[PDB]
Design a protein around this ligand. Structure first.
Ligand code: CL
Length: 346
RNA sequence: UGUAAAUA
């Protein structure tokens, strides 16, 4: 029987097994649940750097078979850790040709993410040179988008310009990514980490189809990131569009969160625009803030208004809603809605 | 009373 069957049989019988004992059994050990845990434990606990190197040639030689294995991917990742710098370059060479497909695989993509998290900028750039070949499809992928997000978090902005240029490759690409469950996460990282010269055309593209993206189940989060990471003029264009169309935005499922984001991140003069729209007379109807309090989504928006505005801005909300309180108690959940506001009407 | 993610 081979070393692994023997070691799996009685684990404690070989409490004195060492990494240099594995030798040619590394592949079988790494693809085995018990074997892989042994290798990992030894790599993390051994103080012998020559033990740790004794298995590295077999890791490199079997790299393609290990990176997308349920148990072997951990073994490969061990050699991208801080403490194995001396191995990083050799290990990138071992996987580089197949990075374009590793990015889509559920185990291998965790190797790529660990590499980008740990390795120096020349090696990151090398990995991204392969990602560049599959970048559009990669951004829309459950696995590939995690690789792209890590690249944006960990590489200097100038070396992800190719990703920004993919978001800008065609008129509708930013829309297509913003409404994709995976592509929307890439747009968000870009907004968080890219330079102002990179984010400005991206935000400009989002603005052109703003109403659709704001009410999309994924796009509303993209718009929320524009509010938080865009410029003052961006917030102003957004607050201005939201104020002018306050009832439409507040009474839809996803765009209602966009208004809440404006209230949390907004300057006093943005809040004042939203409050003024909310309290405007409307000669032939009740004020918009009252209609919103009757609505399944907008009542949370009104609650957020009261919680976020100045005392003087609360004054106008209180003076506008209080006449209509009796009617509002009747409506569905109207009891609870006004209860959560009682502290402002006491 | 209302929204999001790939490993043993
Ligand atoms: Cl998969």
């Amino acid at each position: 029987d081979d070393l692994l069957t023997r070691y799996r049989a009685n684990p404690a019988m070989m409490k004195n097994l060492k990494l240099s004992d594995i030798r040619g059994a590394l592949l079988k050990f790494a693809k085995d649940q018990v074997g892989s845990r042994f290798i990992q434990q030894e790599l993390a606990s051994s103080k012998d750097r020559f033990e740790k190197d004794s298995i590295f040639d077999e890791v490199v030689s079997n790299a393609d078979e290990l990176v997308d294995d349920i148990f072997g991917n951990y073994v490969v990742q061990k050699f991208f850790e801080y403490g194995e710098e001396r191995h990083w370059a050799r290990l990138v060479d071992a996987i580089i040709d197949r990075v374009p497909e590793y990015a889509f695989q559920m185990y291998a993509c965790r190797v790529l993410q660990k590499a980008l998290e740990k390795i120096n900028e020349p090696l990151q750039i090398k990995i991204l040179s392969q990602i560049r070949h599959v970048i559009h499809r990669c951004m829309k992928d459950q696995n590939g988008c995690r690789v792209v997000q890590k690249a944006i978090e960990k590489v200097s902005p100038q070396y992800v310009q190719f990703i920004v240029d993919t978001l800008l490759e065609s008129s509708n690409t930013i829309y297509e990514m913003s409404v994709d469950p995976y592509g929307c996460r890439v747009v968000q990282r870009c907004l968080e980490h890219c330079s102002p010269s990179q984010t400005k055309p991206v935000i400009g593209q989002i603005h052109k189809r703003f109403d659709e993206i704001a009410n999309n189940q994924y796009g509303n989060y993209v718009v929320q990131h524009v509010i938080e990471h865009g410029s003052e003029e961006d917030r102003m264009v957004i607050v201005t569009r939201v104020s002018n169309n306050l009832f439409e935005f507040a009474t839809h499922k996803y765009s209602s969160n966009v208004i809440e984001k404006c209230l949390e991140q907004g300057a006093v003069y943005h809040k004042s625009m939203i409050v003024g729209a909310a309290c405007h007379h409307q000669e032939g109807s009740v004020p918009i803030v009252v209609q919103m309090m009757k609505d399944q989504y907008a009542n949370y928006v009104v609650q957020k208004m009261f919680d976020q505005v100045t005392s003087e801005q609360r004054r106008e909300l209180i003076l506008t809603v209080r006449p209509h309180i009796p009617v509002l108690r009747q409506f569905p959940h109207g009891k609870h809605i006004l209860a959560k506001l009682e502290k402002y009407f006491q």
